[PDB]
Tab-separated table of C-alpha atoms in Angstrom:
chain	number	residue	atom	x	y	z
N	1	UNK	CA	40.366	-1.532	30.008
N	2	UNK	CA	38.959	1.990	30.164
N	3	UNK	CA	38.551	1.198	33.864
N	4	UNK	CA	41.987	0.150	34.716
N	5	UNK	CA	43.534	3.333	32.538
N	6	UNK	CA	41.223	5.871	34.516
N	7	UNK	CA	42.815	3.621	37.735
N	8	UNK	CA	46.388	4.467	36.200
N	9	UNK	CA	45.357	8.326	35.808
N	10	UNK	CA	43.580	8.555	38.835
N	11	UNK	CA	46.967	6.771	40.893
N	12	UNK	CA	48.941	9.605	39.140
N	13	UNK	CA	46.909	12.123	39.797
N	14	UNK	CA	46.855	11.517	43.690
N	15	UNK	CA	50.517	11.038	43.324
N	16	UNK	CA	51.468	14.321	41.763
N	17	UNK	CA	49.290	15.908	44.672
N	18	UNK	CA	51.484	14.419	47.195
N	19	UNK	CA	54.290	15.516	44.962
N	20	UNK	CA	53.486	19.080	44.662
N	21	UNK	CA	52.184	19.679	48.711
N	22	UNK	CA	56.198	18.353	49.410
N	23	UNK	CA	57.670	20.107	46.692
N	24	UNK	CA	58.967	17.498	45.022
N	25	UNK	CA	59.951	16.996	41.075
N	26	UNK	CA	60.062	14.091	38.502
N	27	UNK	CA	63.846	14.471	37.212
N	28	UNK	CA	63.737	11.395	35.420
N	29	UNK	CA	61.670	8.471	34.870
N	30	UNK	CA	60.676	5.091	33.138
N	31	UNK	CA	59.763	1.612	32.757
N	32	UNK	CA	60.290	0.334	36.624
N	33	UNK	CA	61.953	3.814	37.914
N	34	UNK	CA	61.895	7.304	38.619
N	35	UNK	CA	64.257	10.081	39.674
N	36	UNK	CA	62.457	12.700	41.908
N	37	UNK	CA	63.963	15.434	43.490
N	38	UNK	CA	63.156	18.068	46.332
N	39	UNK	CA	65.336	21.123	48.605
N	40	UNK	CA	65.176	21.013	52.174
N	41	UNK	CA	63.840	23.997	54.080
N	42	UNK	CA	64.320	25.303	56.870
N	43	UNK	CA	60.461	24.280	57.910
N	44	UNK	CA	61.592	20.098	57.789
N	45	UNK	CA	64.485	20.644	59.964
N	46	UNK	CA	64.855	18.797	63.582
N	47	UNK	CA	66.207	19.566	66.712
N	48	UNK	CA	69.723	19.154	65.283
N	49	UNK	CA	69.109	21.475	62.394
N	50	UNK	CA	68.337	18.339	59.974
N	51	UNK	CA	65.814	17.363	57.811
N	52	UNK	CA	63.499	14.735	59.708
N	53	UNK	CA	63.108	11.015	59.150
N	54	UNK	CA	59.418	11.663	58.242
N	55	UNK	CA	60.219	14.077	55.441
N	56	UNK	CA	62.967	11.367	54.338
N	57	UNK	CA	60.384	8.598	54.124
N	58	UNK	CA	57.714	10.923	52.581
N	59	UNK	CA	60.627	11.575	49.769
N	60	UNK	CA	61.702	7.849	49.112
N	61	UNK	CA	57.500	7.119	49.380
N	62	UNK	CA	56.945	9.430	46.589
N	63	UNK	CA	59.366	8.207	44.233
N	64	UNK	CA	57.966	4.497	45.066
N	65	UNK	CA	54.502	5.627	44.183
N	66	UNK	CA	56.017	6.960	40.448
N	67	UNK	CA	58.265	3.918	39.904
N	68	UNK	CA	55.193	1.921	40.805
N	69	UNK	CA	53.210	3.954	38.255
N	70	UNK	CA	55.455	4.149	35.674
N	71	UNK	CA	53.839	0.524	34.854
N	72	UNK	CA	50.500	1.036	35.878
N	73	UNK	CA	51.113	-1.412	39.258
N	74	UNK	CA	49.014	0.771	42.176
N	75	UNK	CA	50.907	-0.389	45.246
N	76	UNK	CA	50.867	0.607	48.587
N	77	UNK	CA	53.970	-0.638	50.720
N	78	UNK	CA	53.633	-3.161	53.310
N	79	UNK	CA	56.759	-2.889	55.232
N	80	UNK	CA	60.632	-1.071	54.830
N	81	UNK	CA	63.813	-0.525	55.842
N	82	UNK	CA	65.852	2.563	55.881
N	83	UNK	CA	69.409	3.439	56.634
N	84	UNK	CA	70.624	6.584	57.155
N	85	UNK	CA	74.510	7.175	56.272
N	86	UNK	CA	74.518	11.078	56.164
N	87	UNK	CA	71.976	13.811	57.452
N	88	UNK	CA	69.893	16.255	54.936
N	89	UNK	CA	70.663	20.025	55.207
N	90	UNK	CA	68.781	22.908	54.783
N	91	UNK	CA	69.142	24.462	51.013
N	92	UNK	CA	70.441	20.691	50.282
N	93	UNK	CA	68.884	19.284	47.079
N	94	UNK	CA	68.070	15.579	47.442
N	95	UNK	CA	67.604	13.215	44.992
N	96	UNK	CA	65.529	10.070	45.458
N	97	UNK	CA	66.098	6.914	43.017
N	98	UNK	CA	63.498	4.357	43.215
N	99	UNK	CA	63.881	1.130	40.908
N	100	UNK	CA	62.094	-2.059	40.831
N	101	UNK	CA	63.983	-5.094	41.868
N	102	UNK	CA	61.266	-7.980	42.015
N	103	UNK	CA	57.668	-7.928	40.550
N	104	UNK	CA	55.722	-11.204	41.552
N	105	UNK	CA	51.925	-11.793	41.306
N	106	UNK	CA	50.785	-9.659	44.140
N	107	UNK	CA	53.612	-8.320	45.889
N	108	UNK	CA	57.385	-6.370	44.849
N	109	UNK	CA	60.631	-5.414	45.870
N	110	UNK	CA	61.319	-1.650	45.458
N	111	UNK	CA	64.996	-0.031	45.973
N	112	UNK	CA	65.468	3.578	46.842
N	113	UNK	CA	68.597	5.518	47.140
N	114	UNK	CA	68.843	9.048	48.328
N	115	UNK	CA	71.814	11.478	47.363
N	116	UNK	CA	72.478	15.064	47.635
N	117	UNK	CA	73.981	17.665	45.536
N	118	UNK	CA	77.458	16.538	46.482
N	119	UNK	CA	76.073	12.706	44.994
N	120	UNK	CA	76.796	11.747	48.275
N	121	UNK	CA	74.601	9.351	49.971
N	122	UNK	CA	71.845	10.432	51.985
N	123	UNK	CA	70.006	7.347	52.808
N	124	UNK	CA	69.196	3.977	51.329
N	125	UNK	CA	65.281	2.122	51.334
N	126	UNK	CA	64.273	-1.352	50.330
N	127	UNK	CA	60.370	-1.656	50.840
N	128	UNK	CA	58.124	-4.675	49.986
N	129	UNK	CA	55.143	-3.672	48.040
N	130	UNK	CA	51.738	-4.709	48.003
N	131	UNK	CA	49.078	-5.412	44.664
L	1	UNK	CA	64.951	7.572	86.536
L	2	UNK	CA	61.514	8.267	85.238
L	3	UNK	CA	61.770	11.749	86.532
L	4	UNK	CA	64.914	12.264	84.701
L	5	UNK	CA	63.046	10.707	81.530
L	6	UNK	CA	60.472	13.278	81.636
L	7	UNK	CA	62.692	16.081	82.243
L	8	UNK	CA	64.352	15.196	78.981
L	9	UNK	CA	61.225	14.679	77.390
L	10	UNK	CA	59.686	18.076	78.483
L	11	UNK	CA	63.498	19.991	76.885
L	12	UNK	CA	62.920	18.045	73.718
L	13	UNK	CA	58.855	18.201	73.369
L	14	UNK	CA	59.500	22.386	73.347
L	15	UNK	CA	61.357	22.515	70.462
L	16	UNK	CA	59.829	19.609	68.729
L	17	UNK	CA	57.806	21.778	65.751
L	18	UNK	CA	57.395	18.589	63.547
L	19	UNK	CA	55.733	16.561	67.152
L	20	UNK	CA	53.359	19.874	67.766
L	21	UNK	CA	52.535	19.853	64.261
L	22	UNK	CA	51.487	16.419	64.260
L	23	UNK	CA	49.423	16.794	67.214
L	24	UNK	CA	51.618	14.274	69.221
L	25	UNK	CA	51.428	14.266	72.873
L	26	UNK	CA	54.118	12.359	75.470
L	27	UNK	CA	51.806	10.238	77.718
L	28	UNK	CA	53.966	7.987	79.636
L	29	UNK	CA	58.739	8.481	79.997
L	30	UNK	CA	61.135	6.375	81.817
L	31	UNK	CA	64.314	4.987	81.322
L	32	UNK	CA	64.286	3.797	77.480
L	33	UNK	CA	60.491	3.868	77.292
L	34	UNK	CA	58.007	6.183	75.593
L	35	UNK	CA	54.018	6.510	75.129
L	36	UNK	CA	53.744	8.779	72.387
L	37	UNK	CA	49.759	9.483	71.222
L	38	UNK	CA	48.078	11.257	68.082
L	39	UNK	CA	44.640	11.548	66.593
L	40	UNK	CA	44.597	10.801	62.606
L	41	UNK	CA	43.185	13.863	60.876
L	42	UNK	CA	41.909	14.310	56.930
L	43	UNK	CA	44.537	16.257	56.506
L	44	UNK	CA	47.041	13.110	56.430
L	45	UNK	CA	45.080	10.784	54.463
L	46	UNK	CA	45.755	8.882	50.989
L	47	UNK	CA	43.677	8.104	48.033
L	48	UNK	CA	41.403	5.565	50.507
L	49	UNK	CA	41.174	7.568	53.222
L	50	UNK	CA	44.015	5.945	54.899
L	51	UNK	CA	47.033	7.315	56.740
L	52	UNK	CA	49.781	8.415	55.099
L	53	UNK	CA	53.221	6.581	55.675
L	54	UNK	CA	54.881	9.141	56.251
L	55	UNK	CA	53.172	10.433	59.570
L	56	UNK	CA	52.555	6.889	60.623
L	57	UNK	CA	56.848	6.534	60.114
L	58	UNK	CA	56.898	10.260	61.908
L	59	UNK	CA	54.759	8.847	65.084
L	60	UNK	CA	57.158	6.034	65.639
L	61	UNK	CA	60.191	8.031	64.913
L	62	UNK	CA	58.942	10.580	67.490
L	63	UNK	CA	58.643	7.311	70.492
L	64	UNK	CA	61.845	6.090	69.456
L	65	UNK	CA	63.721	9.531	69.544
L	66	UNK	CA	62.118	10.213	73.221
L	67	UNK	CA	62.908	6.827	74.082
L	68	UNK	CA	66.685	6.855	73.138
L	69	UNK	CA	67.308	9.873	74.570
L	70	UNK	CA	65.501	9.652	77.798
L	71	UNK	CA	68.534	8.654	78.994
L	72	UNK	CA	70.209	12.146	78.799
L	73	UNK	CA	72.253	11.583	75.955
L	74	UNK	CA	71.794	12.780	72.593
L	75	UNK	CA	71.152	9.432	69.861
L	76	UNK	CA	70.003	9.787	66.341
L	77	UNK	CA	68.726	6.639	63.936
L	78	UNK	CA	71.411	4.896	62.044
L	79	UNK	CA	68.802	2.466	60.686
L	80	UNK	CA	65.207	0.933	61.135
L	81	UNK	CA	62.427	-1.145	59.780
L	82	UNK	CA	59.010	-0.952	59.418
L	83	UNK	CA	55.960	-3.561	59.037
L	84	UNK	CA	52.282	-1.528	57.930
L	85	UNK	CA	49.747	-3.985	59.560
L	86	UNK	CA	46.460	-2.243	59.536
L	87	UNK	CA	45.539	1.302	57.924
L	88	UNK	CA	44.383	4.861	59.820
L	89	UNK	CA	41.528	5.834	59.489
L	90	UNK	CA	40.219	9.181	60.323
L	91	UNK	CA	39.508	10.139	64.059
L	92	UNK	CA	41.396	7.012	65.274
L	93	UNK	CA	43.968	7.798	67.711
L	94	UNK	CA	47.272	6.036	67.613
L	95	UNK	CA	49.558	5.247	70.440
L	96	UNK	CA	53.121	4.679	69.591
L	97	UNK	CA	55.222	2.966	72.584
L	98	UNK	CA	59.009	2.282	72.258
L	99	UNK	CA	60.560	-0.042	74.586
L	100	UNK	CA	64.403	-0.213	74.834
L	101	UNK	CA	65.766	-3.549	73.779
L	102	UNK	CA	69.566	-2.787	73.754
L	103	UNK	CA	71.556	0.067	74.919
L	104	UNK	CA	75.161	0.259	75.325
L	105	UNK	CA	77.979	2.803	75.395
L	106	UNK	CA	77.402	3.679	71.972
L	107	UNK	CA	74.779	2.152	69.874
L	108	UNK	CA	70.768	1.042	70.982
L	109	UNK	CA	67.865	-1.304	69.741
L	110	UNK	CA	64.446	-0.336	70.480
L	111	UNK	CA	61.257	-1.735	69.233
L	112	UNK	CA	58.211	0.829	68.544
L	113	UNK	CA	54.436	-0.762	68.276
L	114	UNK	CA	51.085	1.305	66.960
L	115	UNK	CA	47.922	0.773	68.403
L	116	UNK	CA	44.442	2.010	67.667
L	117	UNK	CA	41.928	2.805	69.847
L	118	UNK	CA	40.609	-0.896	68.880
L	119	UNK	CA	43.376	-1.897	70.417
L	120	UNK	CA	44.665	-3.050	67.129
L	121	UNK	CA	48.075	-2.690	65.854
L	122	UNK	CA	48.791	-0.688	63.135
L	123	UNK	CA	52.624	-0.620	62.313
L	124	UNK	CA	55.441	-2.566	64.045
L	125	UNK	CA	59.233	-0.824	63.746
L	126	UNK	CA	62.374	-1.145	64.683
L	127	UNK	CA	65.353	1.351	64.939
L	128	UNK	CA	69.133	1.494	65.635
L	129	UNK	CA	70.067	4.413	67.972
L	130	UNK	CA	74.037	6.004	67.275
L	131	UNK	CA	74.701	8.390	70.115
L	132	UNK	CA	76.190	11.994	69.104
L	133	UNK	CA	78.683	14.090	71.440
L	134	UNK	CA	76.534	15.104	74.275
L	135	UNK	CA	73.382	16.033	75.708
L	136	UNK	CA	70.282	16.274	74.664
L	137	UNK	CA	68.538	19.755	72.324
């Protein structure tokens, strides 16, 4: 009991490190979601002046680890697909949506939708989750 | 067409601040193929000392973008899928190789693979390459 909420707080604390070192902020969230949100800088910008998959995946991760938490379910994710409709600008604010779609014994289904400040669609991630 | 490969490599490796970063070196370039290496530091691990997604997604990204666009002409990800197989621990050195598996006039499969040092493998992933305008940056 005492063990698994210190588990809960300890999850949350790592994730609101990774949070903070990307700049990221909880807009939103509850039972089985949470709305994040971060700006692209100049610093996470490609060759062609957009922000890079890596920083993408780092967002959508982030706001996987809170919807995850948001229940107290410590998951790490054990595969994912991602498809990228539009590219993320510097100064751009992005969004990140992640929601719960499946919950069985061990493993989960996790949705995550990127936008920007036009609530255009940035990218879209469906990862299977693990514990 | 290796020698072409590498060229393109060596334009794209000089302005590649997020590769550099990483510590990711090019070890092997030909025509849709890429060795890509890096050594997992402290500095990119989770709550259990493991590797972060996001610079194991960032190492296969970096083989697939060399590999679709060892060809000369600029290509960016539409889409791709990863599998997480095995963690990173610190001080083991990844190798990332993307092999070509489709390319036509417009769009490209190729199929990335992680390896330790172990030889193990780490991640599997897959990405769809859309080519944009013209050459390479």
């Amino acid at each position: 009991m005492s063990h698994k909420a210190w588990q809960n707080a300890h999850a949350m604390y790592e994730n609101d490190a990774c949070a903070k070192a990307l700049g990221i902020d909880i807009i939103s969230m509850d039972e089985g979601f949470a709305v994040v949100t971060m700006t692209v800088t100049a610093q996470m910008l490609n060759g062609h002046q957009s922000c890079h998959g890596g920083q993408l995946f780092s967002l959508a991760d982030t706001a996987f680890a809170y919807a995850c938490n948001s229940q107290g379910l410590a998951a790490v994710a054990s595969a994912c697909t991602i498809d990228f409709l539009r590219p993320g600008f510097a100064g751009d604010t992005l969004t990140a949506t992640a929601q719960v779609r499946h919950q069985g014994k061990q493993t989960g289904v996790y949705d995550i939708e990127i936008v920007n400040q036009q609530q255009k669609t940035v990218a879209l991630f469906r990862g299977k989750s693990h514990r």
